[PDB]
Amino acid sequence: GICFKDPFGSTLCAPD
């Protein structure tokens, strides 16, 4: 359920 953003600008979300 948690989402983490990278410094490069990539949008990725976790399974939590």
| Cα 7 to chain centroid, rounded | 10
**How far is it, in rounded angstroms, from Cα 9 to Cα 16?**
21
Technique employed here was: NMR
- Residues 10, 3 contacting (CB under 8 angstroms): no
Residue 16 one-letter amino acid: D
**Start-to-end CA span in the chain (Å):** 4
- Partnered with residue 11 across adjacent β-strands are 5
How far apart, in whole angstroms, are the C-alpha atoms of residue 10 and residue 7?
7
